Amino acid sequence: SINQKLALVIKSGKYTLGYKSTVKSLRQGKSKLIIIAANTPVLRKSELEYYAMLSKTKVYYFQGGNNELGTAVGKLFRVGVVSILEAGDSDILTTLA
Amino acid sequence: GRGAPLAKVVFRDPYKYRLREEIFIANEGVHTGQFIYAGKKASLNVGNVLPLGSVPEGTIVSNVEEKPGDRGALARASGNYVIIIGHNPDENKTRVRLPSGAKKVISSDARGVIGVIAGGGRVDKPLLKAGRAFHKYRLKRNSWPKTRGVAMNPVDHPHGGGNHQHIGKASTISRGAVSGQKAGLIAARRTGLLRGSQKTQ
């Protein structure tokens, strides 16, 4: 599944969590794909979607709240957005995404 | 003094450069910052206000107008609503069912707001003690507490007097009764513990 894919990234790849550090990555073009939680407010969503297209970065709308995304990355806290810095053994960068 | 919370909803004035604010009753689920749409052509989403003609049957709306424009008559108390049960496009009536169970038929231009009214279940909690009822009616009107007419002397009430405390005659008073007679069960078409299923046919 998509989570099983995100699980692969987490255990073999480079990434960051949180809104401030995903813009650090988006400005430097380091991000290959950002994942956006369902309940993330639209203003932030539209803001990332602008940064992302200026970075020419793909954007996956996670069909789930920020609580679930935190579980998805395997953390006990919640995350609103993820940034894939390097895709590890996973294929998320070139798949249905 | 009201059951249901109110919703302050501000609009632009289409004719003057100014903000004009209305006072709606909060339909359950509406929130601060929500966008409310109000009009004939308007999406069928909780919180919006639509003419009864423009919603399918089964729609559940509150604060509905009796005649179009009276700015809200039916289904206002916390927890109530009306359901549309059909349409007659020629004459553009819309048959609805009111919280009482009554099934009135009103104009399809009449306006209602999608959803039910916030604050439901308020009447499931025991007041538990006099003071709760005191502070209740304190902010409504001087209707509480209620001395029984059967505890007063006859000057005071039809039920007053007697060496024992009793009504003395049938407490069912006719519609044609006159002021000062009507006390008890006015125009009662029946009486006694309602056993068996209610729910109008």
Binding site: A37, N39, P41, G65, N66, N67, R78 | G3, A4, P5, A7, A26, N27, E28, G29, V30, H31, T32, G33, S43, L44, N45, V46, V55, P56, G58, T59, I60, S78, G79, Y81, I114, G115, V116, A118, G119, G120, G121, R122, D124, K125, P126, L128, K129
Partner: protein
């Protein structure tokens, strides 16, 4: 240490008003003082004040709900039966 065997929050009324009334209150009273999950910001910071009104500690959103609980079963199904009807007017 367990302080009371069944009254819980309802122990403030003590012996008064009759066990059954106290029982009914304890339910809704537990319903109404509790912290709820916020739809918008994903934290459990929704609390009540003024029955009907439910606002979130941070993110400062205020939702109209049921008198002693955020979502009431009625408004819940009404949500879905409106969701159903709405979809009949696009597809």
């Amino acid at each position: 240490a367990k302080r009371t065997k069944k009254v819980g929050i309802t122990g403030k009324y003590g012996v008064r008003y009759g066990s059954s009334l106290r029982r009914q209150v304890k339910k809704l009273e537990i319903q109404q003082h509790a912290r709820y999950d916020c739809s918008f910001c994903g934290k459990k910071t929704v609390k009540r004040g003024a029955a009907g009104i439910w606002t979130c500690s941070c993110c400062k959103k205020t939702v109209a709900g049921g008198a002693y609980t955020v979502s009431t079963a009625a408004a819940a199904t009404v949500r879905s039966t409106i969701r159903r009807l709405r979809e009949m007017v696009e597809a």
